[PDB]
Amino acid sequence: MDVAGLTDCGLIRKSNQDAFYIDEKHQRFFIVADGMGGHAGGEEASRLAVDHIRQYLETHLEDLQHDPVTLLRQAFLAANHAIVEQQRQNSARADMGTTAVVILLDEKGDRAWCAHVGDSRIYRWRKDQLQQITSDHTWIAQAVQIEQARQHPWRHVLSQCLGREDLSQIDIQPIDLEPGDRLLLCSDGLTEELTDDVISIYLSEPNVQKAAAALVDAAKTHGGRDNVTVVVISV
């Protein structure tokens, strides 16, 4: 399968606390993390999350692929710990944090595991049809399902994120992959500017490197309020 990643600061923020990583060699897992935190806390956080999940997976992939849930859950904690450790040290970054979305493909690339903590999403496109797999870990999001798409007040506050000692929710769930459909991993940066409609259109793009770029370009054109990162995987 063809995979492509691409990040970018956007049109406003001078820095970039987004991060991502693709397992180019084997293509077994993918990551994306939206970091937050003053004094370059966000960059540290997202990097830590990605490095730690990544390393943890490369270590117990063969060992626990028969049990993906434990694998992912454990990986996320490895990162959550890493981050929390940094908070306790550098006091300027006590409030650093990050989100993370990860996809873990089965040896036989037919099943796709989706783990996540935060408001970065995972989408599944199939035969001109986009579907959101993950559920934003936020209050207003967790208001609805008691509130309508009139989201706009506090709609930004996360309710979960790596880098909290009380971390109580690592959403892991499988989805079936039918040759042809596409997989997407993004950060609020994408979805805050583009609607699922627009997103679906660009994803239809046959070339993943073309889509990924179209996605980021599109995103920045609607405005670049946040750092945007996307990982497009064609099954």
Q: Rank residues 8 and 34 by Cβ distance to Mg ion and give the closer one.
A: 34
Q: Is 178 annotated as a binding residue?
A: yes
Q: Is 44 annotated as a binding residue?
A: no
Closest residue to Mg ion: CB criterion: 188
Tell me how far, at minimum, the Cβ of 156 lies from Mg ion, in Å.
Answer: 6
Instruction: Tell me the closest approach of the beta carbon of residue 179 to Mg ion, in angstroms.
Output: 32
Residue 167 and residue 178 in contact, taking contact as beta carbons nearer than 8 Å: no
Rounded to an integer, what distance in angstroms lies between the CA atom of residue 227 and that of residue 19?
10
Nearer to Mg ion, 138 or 200 (CB): 138
Kindly list the residues in this chain that would bind Mg ion in the complex (CB under 5 A): 17, 34, 36, 119, 188, 226
Q: Is 181 one of the annotated binding-site residues? A: no
Q: From CA 65, how far away is CA 46, in angstroms rounded?
A: 25
Q: 69 or 94, CB closer to Mg ion?
A: 94
**Cα within 13 Å of Cα(67), Cβ side:** 8
Question: Three-state SS for 33?
Answer: strand
**Residue 34 is labelled as binding a ligand:** yes
119 annotated binding-site participant: yes
Residues 6+ apart with CB under 8 A from 184: 121, 122, 123, 124, 125, 199, 203, 230, 231, 232, 233
- Shortest gap between Cβ of 145 and Mg ion (angstroms)? 17
Closer residue to Mg ion in complex, CB, 44/119: 119
Tell me the β-bridge partners of 233. Answer: 3, 183
Q: Which residues are known binding-site members for Mg(2+)?
A: 34-35, 119, 178, 188, 192-193, 222, 226
